[PDB]
Amino acid sequence: ENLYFQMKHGRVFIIKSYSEDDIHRSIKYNIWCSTEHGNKRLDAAYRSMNGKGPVYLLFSVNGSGHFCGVAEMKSAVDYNTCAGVWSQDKWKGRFDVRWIFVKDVPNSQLRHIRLENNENKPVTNSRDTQEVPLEKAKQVLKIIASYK
Numbered sequence: 001e002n003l004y005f006q007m008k009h010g011r012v013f014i015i016k017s018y019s020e021d022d023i024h025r026s027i028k029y030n031i032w033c034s035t036e037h038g039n040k041r042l043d044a045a046y047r048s049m050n051g052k053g054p055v056y057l058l059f060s061v062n063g064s065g066h067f068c069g070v071a072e073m074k075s076a077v078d079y080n081t082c083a084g085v086w087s088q089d090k091w092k093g094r095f096d097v098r099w100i101f102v103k104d105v106p107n108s109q110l111r112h113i114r115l116e117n118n119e120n121k122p123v124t125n126s127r128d129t130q131e132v133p134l135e136k137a138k139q140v141l142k143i144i145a146s147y148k
C-alpha cells in the first residue's frame, strides 16, 4: 500500500498553458506567471497558507490530452517584472515554482476524478487556476505519481 497522500494542509490548482514553450521555460528557470485573475487567486492561496503546507500546481498544455507535471509554488506573486518573457506578452508578473514531477500523464488516467466545486466536471476539463478540493487532489497526485 501507499498511504502517503491520504495531510490536511495543502491547496492544489490546475494550470493550463497554451504554450509548450512556456512549460519548457518554467521547467528551466523554476518560474511561472498566470493571468491577472489567476495570479491573484494563486497569490491569495500562497499567502494564507503561511508555509503551513504546499500549494501544488498541476500543469497541462491546452488541447494536448495529458498533464505534463507538478510544481510547488515557492513565492508570492511579484506583479512588476520584465515584460515579454513568455510566449504571449499578455502575462504580468512572476512567481517562483519548484518542479516536482515532469512526466506525461494521459487524461484517460484522470478523467474519472470529478470536481464538486466545478459542476462535477472531470478534473481534465478544468480551466486555468481551477482549484481542486484536497480530497480529489490526493487522488490525482497518487495517480500521477504511480503512472508509468
Ligand SMILES: CNc1ncnc2c(-c3ccccc3)[nH]nc12
Pocket: 016, 017, 018, 019, 022, 032, 033, 034, 035, 038, 062, 086, 087, 091, 128
Ligand atoms: C505564462 N503563463 C501562461 N502561458 C500560457 N498560457 C497561460 C494561461 C491560460 C489562460 C487561459 C487559458 C489557457 C491558458 N494562463 N497562464 C499561461
